[PDB]
């Protein structure tokens, strides 16, 4: 029985001094990195002057020697130019020239191009937009482009189409690639090889998603090596061509977390390719990728350079990125490795290609700092400093200075001095981009320094995949190539020496003023939680020890009453991944003590309510500091008690910290003496986020001034007990926070207790409905319903159309469906694939499914852990077997024998014929897949809505018309565009749904605390300038009927309503996070008096809703002669259960009438209804008798604006 | 410039729809498109689909896409002013059909 | 100024839109008011003309 965490994340090899110096610099503050780089990059005044002169000469030559020309000839707008290139791209998909030329001449030119061209013409328009305009738009306005294409064809006809086709053919066949195939690329390289250039070929292709795709990339590299080696014909590694490879192409799980697989499976493949490169004596360069792959790649480089089978060949090459803070230390390591191995490693120094993505990832992950610089000039200094280090080691490495920056080039040219021979070092550039500059460098007439051209090879399709990222290295406002074209930029500015510019700044190395450190994402509002970097070996080593220490601790959970711990029945808590691993002991609460706890809470309520809100919020902030400091220990407990992976446990602790700090800040923004607490609040939480959801509900209740009875899920009491311990340590009094471990009976006993003033429930819809029924019997002492927040299940869909990028879709689907073994309320349950792309995506998804490692979660290499109990496993497996029995195709990963000691369900994909094949939420790792024809998209959205759930929803498309359509028609609380549908972040994606998925208000949102006080405050930013027009028509009708006071109240409701609020919430770069307030739907109105009905109708209409009015009220004659606009929103209901689902209810009556109606409402099928009740006298006295906060629906939408390949804003 | 009701038929003088009224087949004006699809049009198209009125359902979806309803543009002008141009529904359209298919096409155009 | 602007605006709109399949209606009668006796006069006529129609 393996000891906990004994094999958590052992490194590939013991970390040498040189390796640890690399790791130490991973996230070093920018002000610490720059001073030594400035020192190393300094050159003499004579050299600086000579370099400036050379750089000026080069820039002058560049400025004194396509799409623009076409746009000019035909007077095309930008959209017309983009649309034309999209059309040319589509036309070039037609393989035969004569067939294409006839379609153009007889059909496309002669009008309806739509008629003749399952995929939008405009799927790649973001790329063509970059070509035409130099600007990147994340999504495509396909209606604008369709209009522009019709306009340009109808205006200019076949000639413009001809020119567009020829232009696109040249760009895609000759400019963006050296050739479509390696043979074609080789044939086209002869011309510049005769002029003194060399080549390194890049077979466009990165990121294998499946074993089969990695195998295809391997055979593509192997075949390219043969062709390059044959062509090289003994020219050797310096004069002759080489190949560049990306390691992520060669294995579908190239990551530190899968290091053992990488060394066991990827390394041999690289070795095989290297052996072939050695036999032909060509270069083989390992390209550099994301920052979290840098150190892993060094382990492969070390093994290859020490492998005797590769001896005698100096062609092994390796890229280092100067924008990275580790660059100089990586170079020290490589130079030393070259010395030890005797291999003259070819070192390609680049600035770096992933900058935008690195900024976003570090922000998302809450890490201490960025692994790259944030000011471009810093990268330039780093590049020059690293060049100095390389030029001092030309006996042991071969430096390759890959840059198009003439100032960088000139600085290095003079740095290297007058002694040169081929093989000492070289420059490099990209095909189709750098030849203008390097034709001023290569040859005896110029600077007589060689340049190797990096030559992309691939078909149009492969080309377009990552062409945006390629372009951005030269369109950004910071890019040299962009500046050298800007006539507003002088040569003097271009030849400015970055070393001296940085030296003379006030703070050397200061972070970019406009990029927030991850901790500062929310500015002055609150401190972002901090995560942990599972690619950092120091972090892994420290975490290994803390995790082991956490498993030695004697975790317990006890009934913690106001008077002290209570006795109860005690049992062990077992690790779901291995029942032999006892995590702790829980003592469960008797029903008697649960009732006693509520009485103690009631008697302590005044003392807690009297703690000022700012001091209550200070307790939450202190608790957040404590959880942040304790995160490693908390991780270990969550991993073992709840079966979570480390990555997911980190995110969970972060979320708990974020809840605490968010509700503390919301309190500081809102709560005052008139926002009185409800009283004792029962907080019932689910097992699956046993710290974060548990903490969030309790923290909210507490900071609003209510004492809390915390009832954690029976599966996960230990982390709950630790969260309560932390909150108490932070200053929450024991009387204000009591912990009552146990099962649903303890929850039910708490709900039923007379002094319970409010219930916060997160869990299954079915249990919420039992709680709703129990509360329907109850009124507060004031005669009003006991507030219930019930956040429940989902049946979450993602719709994918033919414009989406399969690899992105698969990654987001795998994460959304199978992260946490699907045990997230937000998890993807139904993937909907447009018919034309379904087979290809499904094949890739199945391939990716089989790369997942399922097992006990105390190993970093585990992707998917167990399900929480044998009962959950049995429930999920019954569903799978029923589906399989109906003949549905079922794909499942095979589980290792070691899973037998726990309760595991393999990730499973089930192909359904119709969405109706699914009945209720299956809370496990089970993805259902349906296919749809594009014309049936609207009906599909209907089908998604028809389940009655409304939690998370995803859409993958590049097309704005589809975004607008689907997002306007879907009815769900959390929407996600071009990203996964999980991991909603507090205050950024306020989380919670509608229908069967929740009552709201959303946790982690601004309306939440207001539900936990008797008088809701006005939340921050909560207002709308928009007035519902039906409300206005109703107010006019009231005035016409002589209901003057009611008409005034209706106008007031129209103004007070926040319907139409539309906000962007601060968050990470590369995402737009929106928060909007919409109508809830159809509100059930149960009036008693005419004036009550008018107030109810005003409240509902002002918040955009329709209504169903109780026909038993007898008030039909009070609504005679309604304007048709209002009548369309009004129905009368005799049988409420037939006319739903409703989305809320408004009730007027005395206490016993309210209780009776509340019981009738609870009995309605379907969603829990948020009911508000008032007496006729309260309606007369209190304009807010019905609070408009609870008559709107919150919607959060998160759009990945980097999905097109990069981040335009940055 | 131009109005509705008793003030005019449109299209507006000095605006992008004007020239299209003076030719037998109107061109697509500059910037004249919308990403929004009328939801009632979409419901109509689904109803037509249910009936097997396949050609009409297709014409309805195409009208839904080609409609510029919802266009919302800022026009270039002087500083210190924001000049906006938007396309809205006209109101209630009188439909004078002869045939069922004609009616479905007319409804599609009007709803879109 | 408005007359100049109509002329230049309808010219540009023509350059952005009109091709061989946008045939003219034929003779267009342009009836104008007294109160903008050059601007509205010119605008209606210019548009009709540039769309390919002779004007009365
Ligand atoms: C032959 C060859 C081969 C490769 C590469 C280039 C060449 C020529 N690249 C791409 C390379 O990393 C880089 O993006 C481009 O070459 C552009 O850099 P230049 O020095 O020519 O331009 P320039 O002098 O304009 O520098 C642009 C670069 O500055 C950096 N930058 C921009 N804004 C910044 C900011 N705010 N803060 C900090 N830094 C900022 C970025 O690195 C950006 O690419 C690469 N890249 C890679 O990562 N891995 C690889 O394997 C390769 N392979
Ligand atoms: N919408 C959300 O934010 C959200 C978040 C997490 C989980 N969930 C949902 O929670 C479910 C999984 O969590 P779970 O399995 O712990 O849920 P559950 O419904 O099984 O149990 C939830 C909690 O309610 C308690 N409980 C059970 N029966 C009760 C009763 N009769 N009276 C009072 N309390 C009772 C349990 O002890 C537990 O504390 C899923 O359906 C998931 O979708 C929703
Ligand atoms: N808010 C969580 C869902 C709660 C889990 O069940 C998420 O978005 O992953
Ligand atoms: Mg349960
Ligand atoms: Mg019910």
Per-residue DSSP letters for A363-418? HHHT-SS-SB-SSHHHHHHHHHHHHHHHHTTTTTEEEEEE---HHHHHHHHHHH-S
Q: What are phi and psi of A584, to 5 degrees?
A: 180, -165
Ligand 2 centroid vs A693 CA: distance in angstroms? 11
Q: Record the tokens describing residue A662, joined without a space.
A: 């968010």
Residue B103 Cα distances to A873, B46, B54, B56, B100, angstroms: 56, 16, 15, 10, 5
Q: Record the tokens describing residue A342, joined without a space.
A: 């005797």
Ligand 2 touching residue A949 (CB < 6 A): no
Strand A1192-1200 to A1071-1079 pairing: antiparallel
Residue A984 CA: which ligand 3 atom is closest?
8
Asked if residues A306 and A334 have their Cβ atoms less than 8 Å apart, the reply is: no
> Which residues in chain B are contacts of C5 at CB distance < 8 A?
14
B11 DSSP 8-state letter: P
Q: Residue A1153, Cβ neighbours under 10 Å: how many?
A: 16
- Our CA-based measurement puts residue C16 at a distance from the nearest CA of chain A, in whole angstroms, of 8
Asked if residues A274 and A316 have their Cβ atoms less than 8 Å apart, the reply is: yes
Ligand 1 touching residue A402 (CB < 6 A): yes
Q: What is the secondary structure of A664-677 as a DSSP string?
A: HHHHHHH--TTS-B
The Cα–Cα gap between A634 and C8 comes to 72
The Cα–Cα gap between A69 and C7 comes to 28
SS3 A228: helix
The Cα–Cα gap between A186 and A787 comes to 73
Classify the C-alpha dihedral A1047-A1048-A1051-A1053 as positive or negative.
negative
Q: Which of A647, A765, A812, A991 to mutate to test the pocket of ligand 3 (most atoms within 8 A of CB)?
A: A991
Question: Smallest Cα–Cα separation from A933: which of A835, A863, A1020?
Answer: A835
The Cα–Cα gap between A638 and A661 comes to 21
Classify the C-alpha dihedral A571-A690-A646-A726 as positive or negative.
negative
Per-residue b/e over A233-267, b at no fewer than 16 CB within 10 Å?
A: eeeebbebbbbbbbbbbbbbbbbbbbbebbbebbb
**Which ligand is in closest contact with the Cα of A716?**
2
Asked if residues A198 and A423 have their Cβ atoms less than 8 Å apart, the reply is: no
Residues 6+ away with beta carbon under 8 Å from A627: A634, A653, A656, A657, A660, A695, A723, A726
The Cα–Cα gap between A763 and A921 comes to 12
Helices (H), A928-993: 937-945, 960-969
Q: Record the tokens describing residue A1164, joined without a space.
A: 């309605």
Q: Residue A923, Cβ neighbours under 10 Å: how many?
A: 24
A264 DSSP 8-state letter: I
Nearest residue by C-alpha to atom 32 in ligand 2: A748
C53 marked as binding residue? no
> What's the gap between Cα A918 and its chain centre?
27
The Cα–Cα gap between A405 and A383 comes to 11
Q: Record the tokens describing residue B10, joined without a space.
A: 């449109």
Q: Residue B66, Cβ neighbours under 10 Å: how many?
A: 17
Question: Smallest Cα–Cα separation from A665: which of A364, A1020, A988, A1018?
Answer: A1020
Residue A429's H or E segment, with its range, is: strand A426-430
Classify the C-alpha dihedral B81-B87-B90-B91 as positive or negative.
negative
Asked if residues A495 and A53 have their Cβ atoms less than 8 Å apart, the reply is: no
Classify the C-alpha dihedral A777-A783-A784-A786 as positive or negative.
negative
Nearest to A969 among B27, B33, B39 (CB): B39
Residue A595's H or E segment, with its range, is: helix A591-609
Asked if residues A262 and A300 have their Cβ atoms less than 8 Å apart, the reply is: yes
Residue A716 Cα distances to A645, A719, A736, B76, angstroms: 15, 6, 22, 61
The Cα–Cα gap between A1194 and A1104 comes to 13
Residue with tokens 């079966």: A643
Strands (E), A90-222: 197-203
A1111 DSSP 8-state letter: G
Question: What is the CA angle A840-A846-A851, rounded to 5?
Answer: 130
Q: Residue A950, Cβ neighbours under 10 Å: how many?
A: 28
Residues 6+ away with beta carbon under 8 Å from A190: none
Q: Which neighbouring-strand residues pair with A1082?
A: A1106
Asked if residues A876 and A905 have their Cβ atoms less than 8 Å apart, the reply is: yes
The Cα–Cα gap between A790 and A193 comes to 70
The Cα–Cα gap between A483 and A193 comes to 29
The HSE-up count of residue A619 (CA atoms within 13 Å, CB side) is 29
The Cα–Cα gap between C6 and A218 comes to 64
Q: What are phi and psi of A332, to 5 degrees?
A: -55, -45
> Which residues in chain A are contacts of B28 at CB distance < 8 A?
147-148, 150-151, 154
Question: Smallest Cα–Cα separation from A1036: which of A1098, A963, A947, A967?
Answer: A1098
The Cα–Cα gap between A213 and A201 comes to 20
Question: Smallest Cα–Cα separation from A273: which of A306, A316, A312, A237?
Answer: A316
Residue A348 CA: which ligand 1 atom is closest?
3
Q: Which neighbouring-strand residues pair with A798?
A: A831, A954
The Cα–Cα gap between A158 and A151 comes to 13
Asked if residues A686 and A713 have their Cβ atoms less than 8 Å apart, the reply is: yes
Q: What are phi and psi of A1016, to 5 degrees?
A: -70, 135
Query: Which one of A140, A147, A945 would you mutate to disrupt binding with B, by most B Cβ within 10 Å of its Cβ?
Result: A147
Ligand 1 touching residue A454 (CB < 6 A): yes
Ligand 5 centroid vs A1093 CA: distance in angstroms? 23
SS3 A352: coil
Tell me which residues of chain B, numbers 24 to 63, contact chain C at a CB-CB cutoff of 8 Å.
Answer: 24-30
Question: Smallest Cα–Cα separation from A429: which of A458, A409, A407, A459?
Answer: A409
- Using the Cβ of B105 and the Cβ atoms of chain A, whether some distance falls under 8 Å is answered with no
A895 DSSP 8-state letter: P
Residues, Cβ < 5 Å to ion ligand 5: A 1164
Helices A806-818 and A835-849, axial angle in degrees (round to 10): 60
Asked if residues A991 and A1003 have their Cβ atoms less than 8 Å apart, the reply is: yes
The HSE-up count of residue A404 (CA atoms within 13 Å, CB side) is 23
Asked if residues A338 and A306 have their Cβ atoms less than 8 Å apart, the reply is: no
The Cα–Cα gap between B109 and B56 comes to 11
The Cα–Cα gap between A232 and A32 comes to 45
CA dihedral A316, A322, A323, A326 (to 10 degrees): 80
Question: What is the CA angle A917-A877-A685, rounded to 5?
Answer: 90
Residue A429 CA: which ligand 1 atom is closest?
8
CB contact under 8 Å between C21 and A154, yes or no, is yes
Show me where chain B is broken: residue before each gap, C-N > 2.5 A: none
Backbone φ/ψ region at A380: left (φ over 0), alpha (ψ -120 to 50), beta: alpha
CA dihedral A291, A296, A301, A302 (to 10 degrees): 130
> Which residues in chain A are contacts of C21 at CB distance < 8 A?
111, 154
The Cα–Cα gap between A925 and A905 comes to 7
Q: Which neighbouring-strand residues pair with A1073?
A: A1065, A1198
Question: Smallest Cα–Cα separation from A952: which of A925, A992, A922?
Answer: A992
C35 marked as binding residue? yes
Question: Per this entry, what is the length of chain C?
Answer: 56
Q: Which neighbouring-strand residues pair with A565?
A: A560
Q: What is the secondary structure of A286-351 as a DSSP string?
A: E----GGGHHHHHHHHHHHHH-GGGTT---EEEEEETTBTTHHHHHHHHHHHHHHH---EEEEEE-
Residues 6+ away with beta carbon under 8 Å from A870: A903
The Cα–Cα gap between A228 and A694 comes to 60
Residue A652's H or E segment, with its range, is: helix A646-670
CA dihedral A178, A181, A182, A183 (to 10 degrees): -100
CB contact under 8 Å between C17 and A151, yes or no, is yes
Question: Smallest Cα–Cα separation from A499: which of A417, A418, A407?
Answer: A407
The HSE-up count of residue A508 (CA atoms within 13 Å, CB side) is 16
Q: Residue A815, Cβ neighbours under 10 Å: how many?
A: 18
Experimental method: X-ray
Q: Which neighbouring-strand residues pair with A572?
A: A585
Q: Record the tokens describing residue A1118, joined without a space.
A: 């009070």
SS3 A170: helix
C34 marked as binding residue? yes
Query: Which one of B1, B2, B11, B23 would you mutate to disrupt binding with C, by most C Cβ within 10 Å of its Cβ?
Result: B23
- Sequence-separated contacts (24+) of A211-218 with Cβ below 8 Å: A211/A252, A211/A847, A211/A850, A211/A851, A212/A847, A213/A252, A213/A844, A213/A847, A214/A249, A214/A250, A214/A251, A214/A252, A217/A249, A217/A250, A218/A249, A218/A250, A218/A269, A218/A273
Helices A158-170 and A142-156, axial angle in degrees (round to 10): 120
The Cα–Cα gap between A1134 and A1157 comes to 13
Question: What is the CA angle A925-A929-A935, rounded to 5?
Answer: 150
> What's the gap between Cα C3 and its chain centre?
11
Backbone φ/ψ region at A147: left (φ over 0), alpha (ψ -120 to 50), beta: alpha
Question: Smallest Cα–Cα separation from A715: which of A757, A764, A654?
Answer: A764
Upstream peptide bond of B11 is cis (omega within 30 degrees of 0)? yes
Question: What is the CA angle A1085-A1089-A1090, rounded to 5?
Answer: 90
Strand A397-402 to A426-430 pairing: parallel
Asked if residues A1014 and A678 have their Cβ atoms less than 8 Å apart, the reply is: yes
> What's the gap between Cα A762 and its chain centre?
24
Per-residue b/e over A287-321, b at no fewer than 16 CB within 10 Å?
A: bbbbbbbbbbbbbbbbbbbebeebeebbbbbbbbb
Q: Which of A763, A788, A925, A995 to mutate to test the pocket of ligand 2 (most atoms within 8 A of CB)?
A: A763
> Which residues in chain B are contacts of A942 at CB distance < 8 A?
46
Ligand 1 touching residue A659 (CB < 6 A): no
First CA to last CA distance, chain C = 23
- Our CA-based measurement puts residue A159 at a distance from the nearest CA of chain C, in whole angstroms, of 13
Strand A890-892 to A1082-1086 pairing: unpaired
Residue with tokens 């029995």: A885
The Cα–Cα gap between A382 and A62 comes to 25
Asked if residues A428 and A451 have their Cβ atoms less than 8 Å apart, the reply is: yes
Residues 6+ away with beta carbon under 8 Å from A799: A832, A932, A937, A940, A941, A944, A954, A955, A956, A957, A966
Residue A311 Cα distances to A224, A241, A314, A316, A540, angstroms: 22, 20, 8, 10, 34
Residue A830's H or E segment, with its range, is: strand A828-834
Residue A218 Cα distances to A265, A268, A287, angstroms: 12, 11, 15
Residue A471 Cα distances to A69, A131, A467, A1205, angstroms: 20, 8, 6, 10
The Cα–Cα gap between B60 and A1099 comes to 37
A786 DSSP 8-state letter: P
The Cα–Cα gap between A390 and A745 comes to 70
Q: Record the tokens describing residue A269, joined without a space.
A: 């493949």
Residue with tokens 């739509």: A114
């Amino acid at each position: 029985a393996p000891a906990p965490f004994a094999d958590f994340a052992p490194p590939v090899r013991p970390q040498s001094t040189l390796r640890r110096a690399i790791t130490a610099a991973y996230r070093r503050p920018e002000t610490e990195c720059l001073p030594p780089l400035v020192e190393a990059a300094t050159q003499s005044k004579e050299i600086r002057d000579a370099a400036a002169s050379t750089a000026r000469k080069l820039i002058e030559a560049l400025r004194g020697k396509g799409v623009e020309g076409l746009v000019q000839e035909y007077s095309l707008s930008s959209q017309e130019g983009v649309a034309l290139m999209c059309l040319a791209e589509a036309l070039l998909r037609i393989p035969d020239t004569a067939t294409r030329d006839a379609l153009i001449r007889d059909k496309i030119a002669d009008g309806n191009w739509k008629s003749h061209l399952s995929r939008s013409l405009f799927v790649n328009a973001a790329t063509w937009g970059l070509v035409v305009t130099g600007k990147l738009t994340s999504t495509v306005n396909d209606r604008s482009l369709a209009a522009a294409l019709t306009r340009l064809i109808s205006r200019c006809g076949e000639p413009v189409i001809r020119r567009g086709v020829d232009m696109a053919m040249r760009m895609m066949g000759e400019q963006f690639v050296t050739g479509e195939t390696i043979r074609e690329a080789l044939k086209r390289s002869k011309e510049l090889e005769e002029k003194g250039f060399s080549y390194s070929y890049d077979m466009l292709g990165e990121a294998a998603t499946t074993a089969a795709d990695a195998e295809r990339y391997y055979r593509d590299y192997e075949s390219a090596i043969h062709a390059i080696g044959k062509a090289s014909a003994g020219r050797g590694i310096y004069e002759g061509p080489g190949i560049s490879i990306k390691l992520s192409a060669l294995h579908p799980r190239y990551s530190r977390a899968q290091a053992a697989r990488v060394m066991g499976e990827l390394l041999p493949r690289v070795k095989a390719l290297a052996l072939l490169a050695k036999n032909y004596d060509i270069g083989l360069n390992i390209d550099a990728e994301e920052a979290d792959r840098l150190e892993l790649s060094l382990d492969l480089l070390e093994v290859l350079c020490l492998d005797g089978d590769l001896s005698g060949w100096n062609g092994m090459g390796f890229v280092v990125q100067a924008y990275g803070k580790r660059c100089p230390f990586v170079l020290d390591f490589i130079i030393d490795l070259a010395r030890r191995s005797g291999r003259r490693i070819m070192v390609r120094l680049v600035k770096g290609a992933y900058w935008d993505a690195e900024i976003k990832r570090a922000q998302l992950d809450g890490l201490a700092d960025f692994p790259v610089f944030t000011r471009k000039i810093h990268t330039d200094v780093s590049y020059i400093a690293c060049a100095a280090k390389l030029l001092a080691a030309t006996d042991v490495v071969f430096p390759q200075f890959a840059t198009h920056n003439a100032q960088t080039l000139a600085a290095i040219y003079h740095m290297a001095g007058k002694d040169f021979h081929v093989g000492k070092y070289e420059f490099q550039c990209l095909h189709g981009m750098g030849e203008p500059l390097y034709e001023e460098v290569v040859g005896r007439g110029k600077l007589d320094r060689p340049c190797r051209i990096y030559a992309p090879v691939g078909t149009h399709e492969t080309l377009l995949a990552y062409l945006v990222r390629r372009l951005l290295e030269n369109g950004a406002n910071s890019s040299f190539v962009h500046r050298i074209n800007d006539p507003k930029v002088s040569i003097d500015e271009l030849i400015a020496d970055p070393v001296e510019v940085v030296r003379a700044m006030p703070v050397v190395g200061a972070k970019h003023d406009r990029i927030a450190l991850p901790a500062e994402l929310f500015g002055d509002a609150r401190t972002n939680s901090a995560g942990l970097d599972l690619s950092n070996e120091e972090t892994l080593a420290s975490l290994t020890e803390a995790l082991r220490e956490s498993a030695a601790m004697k975790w317990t959970a006890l009934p913690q009453l106001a008077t002290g711990p209570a006795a109860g029945e005690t049992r062990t808590v077992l690790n779901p991944g291995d029942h032999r691993d006892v995590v702790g002991s829980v003592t469960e609460t008797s029903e008697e003590d649960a009732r006693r706890a509520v009485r103690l809470a009631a008697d302590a309520a005044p003392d807690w309510a009297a703690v000022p809100p700012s001091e209550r919020a200070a307790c939450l902030d202190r608790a957040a500091e404590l959880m942040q400091a304790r995160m490693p220990t908390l991780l270990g407990l969550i991993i073992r008690e709840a079966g979570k992976s480390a990555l997911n446990a980190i995110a969970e602790v972060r979320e708990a910290i974020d809840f605490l700090r968010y509700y503390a800040e919301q309190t500081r923004r809102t709560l005052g003496p008139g926002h009185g607490p409800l009283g004792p609040i029962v907080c019932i939480s689910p097992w699956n986020f046993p710290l974060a959801i548990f903490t969030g509900q309790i923290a909210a209740a507490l900071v609003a001034g209510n004492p809390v009875l915390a009832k954690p899920a029976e599966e996960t009491p230990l982390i709950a007990a630790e969260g309560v311990r932390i909150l108490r340590e932070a200053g929450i009094p024991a009387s204000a926070l009591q912990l009552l471990p146990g099962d649903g009976r303890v929850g039910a006993a708490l709900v039923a207790a007379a002094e319970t003033a409010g219930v916060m429930f997160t869990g299954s819809t079915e249990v919420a409905r039992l709680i709703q029924a129990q509360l329907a019997d109850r009124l507060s002492p004031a005669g009003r319903p006991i507030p219930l927040i019930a956040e429940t299940g989902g049946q979450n869909a993602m719709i994918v159309d033919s414009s989406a990028l399969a690899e992105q879709v698969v990654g987001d689907v795998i994460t959304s469906a199978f992260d946490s073994a699907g045990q997230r309320s937000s998890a993807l349950r139904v993937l909907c694939l447009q018919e034309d792309v379904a087979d290809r995506i499904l094949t890739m998804l199945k391939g990716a499914l089989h790369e997942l490692h399922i097992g006990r979660t105390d190993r970093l290499s585990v992707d998917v852990g167990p399900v929480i109990t044998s009962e959950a496993k049995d429930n999920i497996e019954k569903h799978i077997e029923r589906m399989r029995g109906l003949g549905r195709k079922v794909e499942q990963i095979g589980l290792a024998s070691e899973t037998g000691v726990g309760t595991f369900v393999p990730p499973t994909i089930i192909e359904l014929e119709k969405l109706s094949d699914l009945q209720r939420e299956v809370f496990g790792p089970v993805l259902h897949v349906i296919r749809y024809r594009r014309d049936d998209l609207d009906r599909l959205v209907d089908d998604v809505n028809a389940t009655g759930y409304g939690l998370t929803f995803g859409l993958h498309t590049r097309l704005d018309e589809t975004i607008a359509h689907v997002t306007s028609r879907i009815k769900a609380g959390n929407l996600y565009i071009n990203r996964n549908i999980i991991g909603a972040v507090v205050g950024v994606q306020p989380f919670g749904g509608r229908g069967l998925s929740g009552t709201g208000p959303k946790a982690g949102g601004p309306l939440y605390l207001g539900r936990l006080v008797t008088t809701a405050p006005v939340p921050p930013q909560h207002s709308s300038v928009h007035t519902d027009p039906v409300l206005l028509d109703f107010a006019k009708w009231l005035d016409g009927k002589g209901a003057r006071a009611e008409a005034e109240a209706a106008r007031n409701a129209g103004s007070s309503s926040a319907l139409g609020l539309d906000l962007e919430l601060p968050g990470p770069v590369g995402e737009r996070n929106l928060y909007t307030l919409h109508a809830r739907g159809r509100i059930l109105l149960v009036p008693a008096t005419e004036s009550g009905l008018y107030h109810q109708l005003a409240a509902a209409l002002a918040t955009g809703n329709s209504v169903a009015i109780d026909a038993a009220s007898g008030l039909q004659a009070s609504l005679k002669n309604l304007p048709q606009t209002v009548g369309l929103r009004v129905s009368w209901s005799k049988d409420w259960a037939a006319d739903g689902p409703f989305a809320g209810a408004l009730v007027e009556g005395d206490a016993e009438r309210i209780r009776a109606v509340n019981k009738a409402i609870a009995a309605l099928p379907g969603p829990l209804l948020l009911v508000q009740a008032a007496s006729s006298g309260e309606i007369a006295r209190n304009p807010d008798a019905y609070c408009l906060n609870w008559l709107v629906e919150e919607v959060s939408a998160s759009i990945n604006t980097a999905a097109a390949g990069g981040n335009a804003s940055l």
